Design a protein around this nucleic acid. Structure first.
Ligand SMILES: Nc1nc2c(ncn2[C@@H]2O[C@H](COP(=O)(O)OP(=O)(O)OP(=O)(O)O)[C@@H](O)[C@H]2O)c(=O)[nH]1
Ligand SMILES: [Mg+2]
Ligand SMILES: [Mg+2]
Lengths: 82, 275, 83, 885, 75
RNA sequence: AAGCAGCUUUACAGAUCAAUGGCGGAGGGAGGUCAACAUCAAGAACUGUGGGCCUUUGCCUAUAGAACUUAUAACGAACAUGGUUCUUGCCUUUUACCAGAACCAUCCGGGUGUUGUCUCCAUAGAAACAGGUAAAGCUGUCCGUUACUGUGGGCUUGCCAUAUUUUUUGGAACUUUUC
């Protein structure tokens, strides 16, 4: 989703350059700009065990503005007549 | 508007047509924009590789310019108990600073000291990226009723609102393009005077290429240096051309026919001339 | 205007200024202003009645001056050309 | 073969002004000002002088059609066949132009274009000494790199006003393609960077200190110039100076009112962006892309600029350069910034007090001038001189004194006669004009002219005076030897190939030592000539002028070598003796303090707005004992008995006959110091200079008779012998110089550089600066000079042209060579680099054989040993204790 | 618009002639854009130097319109 | 950048409708795989004109114009061949050759400037007259609007503040001697 992700970068770049920031936070934010030119090669290591067709693609398209039912209740004990 | 006339000299184009010829020519384009890529590969360094009897590793190999190098002059000067060895003097050192590194430099032409370190940013992934854009890999810039003018005072160009025109992304790409793309005006050259494959052997080949081509890149450079080294200038008093003096004669007449007809006529004429 | 610009050209040049009071101050020009008030160095002063003295430094208000004499060479100064 | 120069008087290009009015402006010292353009490498300096010249001359014969269009820069001032081929300024060159500012007051200005390359930092020292103010031209992409940091610190030191040109603004948009708000931030980041280094004065575009320029496109402006052209009509005349104050500096404009905080409901940029950068980028955008007719309407409507019918049929880069030269006129705002920055009352007294001794102003009867350098200007040999007092005509006769004499001759002139100075005749005076000399009958006070007929009298600098009365000779001030910023360290030892061609070489070596000021040429006892230079490119410039220009013979040339220095790391019956026992000296040696050595390298002794220069460091012995006791914590006795500071070294009298008879010592003191100078110049290890050793005169014997003839001539070689005994006993070491490195590489190519620093021996990267707004970053590090042979091109071949380094010797960093110098068992492999523990033995043993001090068949090691100086019976006593190997 | 440049003179004893006949010499403290000049320890010079001279006041200000010329007696 | 005024024009109504003055006009415009003739590598370099010195040349000084080509140097962003000489290679003789050098040429091309020709398209003449060159209104005579207004366009313009100390909204007025 490069197009909106450029727009996330552009507003995030506007933070350092035109606005004052606390010091300890500031060197971590420009470190992200340093990893950007190193092309994210230190955030791309994980356990890709599943093939892209072995993982059945259930890309759950939920948003964080939905009330998400908070199903705590099935972790309790109940009584199967089933 | 584009050509001067049917004599077909002096073409003149516009921006849209020029970027269109640019995008078609991608296969045969030079595709290098900084001159610093040609650091030890320019022809001044080829002349010094010839004159000093050195071999640039991609460069061509030439006979010794001074074959009588065999003599050694006995002296205390260059002896091993004199010399301090820290860095081995590579041949690239001898070509880059030719009057420093090697004694007896003669018929040696000065090379050109580096052009400024070229950072030119091209955008190729998305046409919807604008002309002016803070590209990746660019370091960020971390930093930081009294008076009244008449209203409707404005900047100079403020009546025009768009900074980026639809042709600016093309025009800046034409601005850095190597000749002749940047020109958008020029004269006609002959069909054999355009050297399409010239830029290929004027660049470094590859690592992946086999040793069969890598010689063929060297042999074409060796031809290229010898043409540049010995220029044969034309004389100005050559006013009698062959076709023009034959045209003045009553025994030669002029017409227009097809090329393949003119080829078959020449094969029949040439067969009769020998027979 | 050009006439004042010319006065800047005079600067550092021995110039003669006649006051509307009648005096004459001839000497070097230290400074000038758009107002036209001129201050001189090593001026030889001529009173209106002719008595001549010598003053180390001087400043004269612009309004007072009747005319200024500037170096003849200035005439071909670059600014003057119409086109 | 040597220069492209116009030799005919008739072919000298005419100016737009008459040029006679310019010569009459030379009568006025206040009218003429001398600006020297200095900067980093390839920053557009010579191209900046291209703009001044072609706007001053009506038609140049040298200017071609690719030059008239935007295709190739016309490098007028580069001038030399050597410089055309490198594409690099090698020599100082200049022009003298009449220039008009915004207020249209014409004033004559002498320009000097200093070379940007860091090996030619000696040439810019000539430019700093010549110039009233310096115009420091900055690449906007590189920003403030470290070589900019030195130039801004030097011009503060030389009491020279500064004016800054940010150059190559096209690269900000045509190369880097920054959005306009980002480019403001780039410009704001640079101006913040220069303001941190000028501690005295803020530099800001409102202040008229800072000039924006894009030289290849050939336009320059200040914000004051740009308002007066195009915004002066629209606003009332009282408002204009207040308006341009609001222009830069984060205050915003919309519908007639200014406010510091951002405008609500409005997408807004700062005022400098809205009024300057946004129209400038629309000029770049529309000259490249807009239809020519619709562009032609905007230029009449907004800039009142008519495009020609011929100018419509241009290529895009010539059309862009043409429009910007129509919008931005001749360089008035640059000239205006030069005028407003220079204050002669503030600095001209301090500058002459810096180049000479501080004193009262010499009278106007004295002719008094400073001869900067000898110039190999086209077809002849000219002296570059600047006149500080009096009037000079052709055919005059002038006392011309070399500045190496001026230490004694000034110190003599205090005097609590005749034949003082050689007299040469002023043969011919000319104004430099780049590619030509305009001959002139007389040369007034304040202007820089070229004089033929004075170069035979001096080497590397001179003072030039014609005095009227003998009493006025008491007042006159001599010029100090010129401070070239880089010390010459790189060694080349050259022998002519044909021995019969030797005196022709000696002519050229005397000839080069005039033209190249930074070069130290010496002759050794072996007949081999040693040349000291700044770097690789400096030597390659040196040897081409040697082989091709000056001496047509061929020469044998050694490898790259470096000057070493000799020191000690510990303090050390310590005594010395001669053949005839009438004299006995004892000398101790000690390492000097690291802060003490570092400040003496800075040519002044002190700390915290209190410092004493080395020239008058003897003249305040009470104040000197205050500084040594307070700042460095020495003893009170050691503070009072210091005799002399020779370069990086010190002598202290610590003896009991000084408590007995110091007046007997005082009549012999001046030649102990003369013998001390005779010992530091050639040390005991390898005939190399001594650096950073605290000498203590432990004792001195006076024989039972006084002969002023014999005792004087005998103690001078024996004190030099006695200093060796102190140093060799005191655990001697060998020092090597350290280049500091300034690498500019793209950000992905940084691990290539880090591996490239590991292949060298004593290299370390100390600081890595993200150059903002650019994909490249600055790397600051160090390298030994003996390791920096071909360091410059190894970097580039590995980075494929995206890397560049500047090697320089600003800070005089001398570092201990990692071996032990007295190792009889050090393994020196032939034809390979010796390992790290064998280095101090190797560098001395080879140096002793270049000099001829140690003579072996192939490799015989008689090390620098404490037995040829001390008696051999005492040397066997030293072996049994384990003190001496 | 532009301030007159008296800057070097200030703190120096100065003689200046005002309007028709009068000459006044005093230390000069302040100047403005109209040239109005205020100087302290003012004295009105006349033919007889010690005699007809009379001091004016501790502080005196002068309209710039009546100034004909200013000469500083001093460095 | 609007408006007003000034300037320039303009479709003009004009003053004159004379002598005038300005700008234009006194034998086209675009072309051609058309031609001829000049010219195209040198103190970083050219030519015309005026003045002075020596006695034409040459120098010095003043002035006017410089097309094309050239600086990481060359008409050509391209790139062959031959000759002589020297030094190699191949190794039965020669020719053809190997691949450096030095000096010369040939060949395929190119720019520019004049003049002529050819093709296509043209029509207001006042394009009327008289002189002459290697060239032309080259010159004289001349004709178109017209030199002084008002409307309508453009700006080489006003500095947009027009009375309150440095300029243009008054420190002015009056009387006296000498000659
Ligand atoms: N893009 C760009 N390049 C420029 C500009 N000015 C100069 N250059 C180029 O930068 C290089 C160096 O320019 P120079 O004129 O040699 O500058 P310099 O500072 O005199 O250089 P040195 O001789 O090294 O001292 C050349 O290739 C120029 O064409 C500019 O404004 N923009
Ligand atoms: Mg330069
Ligand atoms: Mg036979």
């Amino acid at each position: 989703s490069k197009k909106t992700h450029d727009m996330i970068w552009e507003k995030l770049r506007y933070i350092l350059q035109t606005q004052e920031l606390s010091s300890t936070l500031r060197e971590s934010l420009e470190t992200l700009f340093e990893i950007r030119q190193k092309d994210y090669k230190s955030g791309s290591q994980g356990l890709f065990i599943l093939d892209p067709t072995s993982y059945t693609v259930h890309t759950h398209s939920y948003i964080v503005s939905d009330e998400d039912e908070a199903n705590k209740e099935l972790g309790n004990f109940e009584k199967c007549e089933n | 508007k584009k050509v001067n006339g049917t004599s077909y000299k002096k073409w003149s184009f516009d921006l849209p047509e020029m970027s269109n010829l640019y995008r078609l020519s991608t296969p045969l384009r030079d595709e290098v924009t900084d001159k610093n890529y040609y650091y030890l590969f320019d022809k001044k360094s080829f002349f010094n590789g010839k004159a000093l009897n050195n071999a640039i590793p991609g460069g061509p190999k030439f006979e010794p310019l001074y074959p009588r190098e065999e003599e050694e002059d006995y002296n205390e000067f260059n002896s091993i108990d004199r010399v301090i060895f820290r860095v081995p003097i590579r041949s690239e050192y001898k070509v880059a600073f030719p009057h420093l590194y090697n004694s007896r430099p003669r018929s040696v032409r000065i090379p050109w000291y580096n052009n400024p370190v070229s950072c030119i940013i091209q955008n190729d992934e998305e046409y919807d990226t604008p002309a002016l854009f803070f590209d990746p890999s660019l370091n960020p810039i971390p930093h930081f009723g009294d008076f009244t003018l008449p209203e409707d005072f404005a900047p100079l160009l403020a009546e025009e609102e768009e900074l980026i025109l639809p042709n600016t992304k093309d025009a800046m790409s034409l601005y850095h393009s190597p000749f002749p793309f940047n020109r958008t005006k020029g004269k006609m050259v002959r069909a054999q005077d355009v050297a399409l494959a010239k830029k290929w052997f004027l660049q470094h080949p590859d690592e992946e290429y086999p040793v069969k081509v890598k010689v063929s890149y060297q042999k074409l450079l060796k031809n290229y240096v010898l043409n540049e080294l010995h220029p044969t200038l034309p004389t100005n008093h050559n006013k009698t051309k062959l076709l023009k003096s034959l045209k003045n004669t009553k025994y030669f007449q002029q017409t227009t026919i097809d090329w393949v007809e003119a080829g078959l006529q020449l094969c029949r004429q040439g067969h009769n001339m020998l027979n | 205007g050009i006439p004042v610009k010319l006065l800047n050209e005079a600067q550092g040049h021995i110039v003669s200024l006649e006051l509307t009071t009648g005096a004459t101050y001839r000497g070097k020009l230290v400074e000038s202003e758009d107002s036209m008030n001129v201050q001189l160095r090593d001026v030889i002063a001529t009173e209106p009645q002719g008595a001549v003295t010598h003053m180390d430094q001087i400043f004269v208000r612009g309004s007072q001056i009747k005319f200024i004499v500037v170096p003849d060479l200035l005439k071909n100064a670059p600014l003057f050309k119409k086109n | 073969e040597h220069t492209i120069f116009t030799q005919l008087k008739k072919n000298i290009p005419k100016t737009r002004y008459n040029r006679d009015y310019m010569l009459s402006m030379a009568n006025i010292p206040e009218r003429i000002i001398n600006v020297g353009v200095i900067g980093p490498l390839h920053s557009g300096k010579t191209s900046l002088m291209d703009l001044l010249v072609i706007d001053s001359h009506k038609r140049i014969p040298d200017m071609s059609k690719n030059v008239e269009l935007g295709w190739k820069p016309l490098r007028y001032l580069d001038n030399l066949k050597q410089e055309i081929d490198r594409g690099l300024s090698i020599k100082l060159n200049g022009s003298t132009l009449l220039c008009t500012d915004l207020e249209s007051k014409s004033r004559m200005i002498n320009f000097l274009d200093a070379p940007g390359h860091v090996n030619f930092m000696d040439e810019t020292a000539v430019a700093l000494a010549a110039s009233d103010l310096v115009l420091i031209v900055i690449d906007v992409v590189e920003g403030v790199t470290f070589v900019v940091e030195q130039l801004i610190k030097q011009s503060i030191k030389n009491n020279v006003a500064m004016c800054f040109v940010i150059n190559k603004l096209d690269r900000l948009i045509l190369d880097l393609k920054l959005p306009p708000m980002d480019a403001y931030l780039k410009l704001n980041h640079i101006i913040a960077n220069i303001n941190s280094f000028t501690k005295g004065n803020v530099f800001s575009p409102i202040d008229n200190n800072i000039i924006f320029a894009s030289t290849k496109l050939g336009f320059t402006f200040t914000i004051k110039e740009f308002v007066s052209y195009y915004y002066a009509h629209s606003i009332p005349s009282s408002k204009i100076d207040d308006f341009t104050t609001r222009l830069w500096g984060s205050v915003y404009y919309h519908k007639g009112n200014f406010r510091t905080k951002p405008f609500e409901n409005v997408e807004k940029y700062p005022t400098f962006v809205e009024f300057i950068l946004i129209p400038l980028y629309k000029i770049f955008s529309y000259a490249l892309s807009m239809e020519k007719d619709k562009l032609k309407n905007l230029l009449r409507s907004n800039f009142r600029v008519n495009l020609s019918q011929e100018a419509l049929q241009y290529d895009p880069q010539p059309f862009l350069k043409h429009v910007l030269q129509l919008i931005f006129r001749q360089q008035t705002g640059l000239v205006d910034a030069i005028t407003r920055c220079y204050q002669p009352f503030e600095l001209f007294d301090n500058k002459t007090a810096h180049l000479s001794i501080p004193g009262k102003s010499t009278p106007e009867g004295t002719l008094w001038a400073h001869v900067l350098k000898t110039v190999d200007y086209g077809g002849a040999e000219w002296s570059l001189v600047r006149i500080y007092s009096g009037l000079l005509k052709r055919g005059d006769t002038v006392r011309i004194l070399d500045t190496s004499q001026s230490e004694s001759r000034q110190k003599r002139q205090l005097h609590d006669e005749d034949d003082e100075t050689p007299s040469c005749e002023v043969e011919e005076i000319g104004l430099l004009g780049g590619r030509y000399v305009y001959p002139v009958h007389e040369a007034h006070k304040g202007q820089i002219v070229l004089i033929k007929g004075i170069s035979s009298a001096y080497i590397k600098s001179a003072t030039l005076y014609s005095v009227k009365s003998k009493e006025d000779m008491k007042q006159l001030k001599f010029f100090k030897p010129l401070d070239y910023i880089t010390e010459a360290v790189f060694k080349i030892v050259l022998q002519p190939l044909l021995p019969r061609e030797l005196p022709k070489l000696l002519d050229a070596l005397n000839k080069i030592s005039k033209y190249y000021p930074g070069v130290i040429i010496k002759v050794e006892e072996s007949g081999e000539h040693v040349i000291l230079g700044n770097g690789e490119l400096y030597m390659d410039c040196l040897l081409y002028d040697l082989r091709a220009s000056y001496a047509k013979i061929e020469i044998k040339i050694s490898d790259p070598l470096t000057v070493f220095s000799e020191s000690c790391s510990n303090e050390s019956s310590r005594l010395g003796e001669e053949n005839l026992p009438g004299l006995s000296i004892s000398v101790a040696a000690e390492p000097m303090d690291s802060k003490m050595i570092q400040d003496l390298s800075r040519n002044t002794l002190g700390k915290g707005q209190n410092c004493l220069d080395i020239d008058g460091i003897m003249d305040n012995p009470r104040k000197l004992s205050k500084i040594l006791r307070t700042e460095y914590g020495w003893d009170s006795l050691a503070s009072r008995n210091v005799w002399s500071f020779y370069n990086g070294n010190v002598l202290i009298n610590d003896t009991l006959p000084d408590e007995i008879s110091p007046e007997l010592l005082s009549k012999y003191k001046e030649q102990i110091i003369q013998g001390f100078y005779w010992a530091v110049k050639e040390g005991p290890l390898a005939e190399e200079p001594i650096y950073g050793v605290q000498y203590k005169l432990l004792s001195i014997s006076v024989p039972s008779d006084v002969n002023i003839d014999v005792m004087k001539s005998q103690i001078i070689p024996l004190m030099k012998k006695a200093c060796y005994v102190g140093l060799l006993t005191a655990i001697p070491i060998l020092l090597e110089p350290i280049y500091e490195v300034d690498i500019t590489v793209h950000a992905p190519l940084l691990p290539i550089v880090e591996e490239l620093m590991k292949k060298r021996r004593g290299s370390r990267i100390y600081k890595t600066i993200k150059v903002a707004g650019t994909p490249l970053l600055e790397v600051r590090g160090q390298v030994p000079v003996i390791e920096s042979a071909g360091f410059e091109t190894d970097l580039r071949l590995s980075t494929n042209g995206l890397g560049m380094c500047q090697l320089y010797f600003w800070h005089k960093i001398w570092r201990k060579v990692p071996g032990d110098v007295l190792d009889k068992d050090a393994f020196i492999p032939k034809l390979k680099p010796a390992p790290i523990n064998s280095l101090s033995r190797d560098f001395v043993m080879k140096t002793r054989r270049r000099k001829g001090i140690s003579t072996g068949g192939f490799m015989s090691n008689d090390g620098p040993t404490l037995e040829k100086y001390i008696s051999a019976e005492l040397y066997a006593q030293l072996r049994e204790n384990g003190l001496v190997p | 618009v532009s301030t007159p440049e008296l800057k070097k003179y200030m703190d120096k004893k100065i003689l200046l002639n005002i309007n028709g006949s009068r000459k006044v010499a005093g230390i000069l403290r302040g100047y403005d854009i109209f040239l109005n000049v205020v100087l302290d320890d003012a004295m009105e010079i006349n033919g007889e130097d010690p005699a007809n001279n009379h001091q004016l006041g501790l502080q005196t200000v002068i309209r710039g319109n009546s100034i004909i010329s200013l000469e500083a007696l001093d460095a």
